[PDB]
Amino acid sequence: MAKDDVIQMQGEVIENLPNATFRVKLENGHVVLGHISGKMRMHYIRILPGDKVTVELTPYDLSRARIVFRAK
């Protein structure tokens, strides 16, 4: 199936920063920085270092992605 250049990766949080920003490391070890938003995200969720979450990398670069809900 064809589509944009968006790909969901499975990584774990490594650090936590303000501005609704968070860092997660993929399988290669590289950490990506992004922001978390949405419905379940506005429910005052609990985030901590070591949690499995999904992140969608953008074509802009490999140093900025979108924070997605936890890894199913």
Curated annotation (Swiss-Prot):
Domain S1-like: 1-72
A GO-annotated cellular component: cytosol
Pfam families found in the cross-reference section: eIF-1a
Signal peptide: none
Localization annotation: Cytoplasm
Single GO MF annotation: ribosome binding
Major location category of this protein: cytoplasm
Keywords assigned: Cytoplasm, Initiation factor, Protein biosynthesis, RNA-binding, rRNA-binding
Keyword Metal-binding part of the UniProt annotation: no
Subunit field text: Component of the 30S ribosomal translation pre-initiation complex which assembles on the 30S ribosome in the order IF-2 and IF-3, IF-1 and N-formylmethionyl-tRNA(fMet); mRNA recruitment can occur at any time during PIC assembly.
Family as reported in the entry's similarity comment: Belongs to the IF-1 family.
Stated role: One of the essential components for the initiation of protein synthesis. Stabilizes the binding of IF-2 and IF-3 on the 30S subunit to which N-formylmethionyl-tRNA(fMet) subsequently binds. Helps modulate mRNA selection, yielding the 30S pre-initiation complex (PIC). Upon addition of the 50S ribosomal subunit IF-1, IF-2 and IF-3 are released leaving the mature 70S translation initiation complex.
Protein name as it appears in the record: Translation initiation factor IF-1
Species annotation: Burkholderia thailandensis (strain ATCC 700388 / DSM 13276 / CCUG 48851 / CIP 106301 / E264)
Origin organism lineage: Bacteria, Pseudomonadati, Pseudomonadota, Betaproteobacteria, Burkholderiales
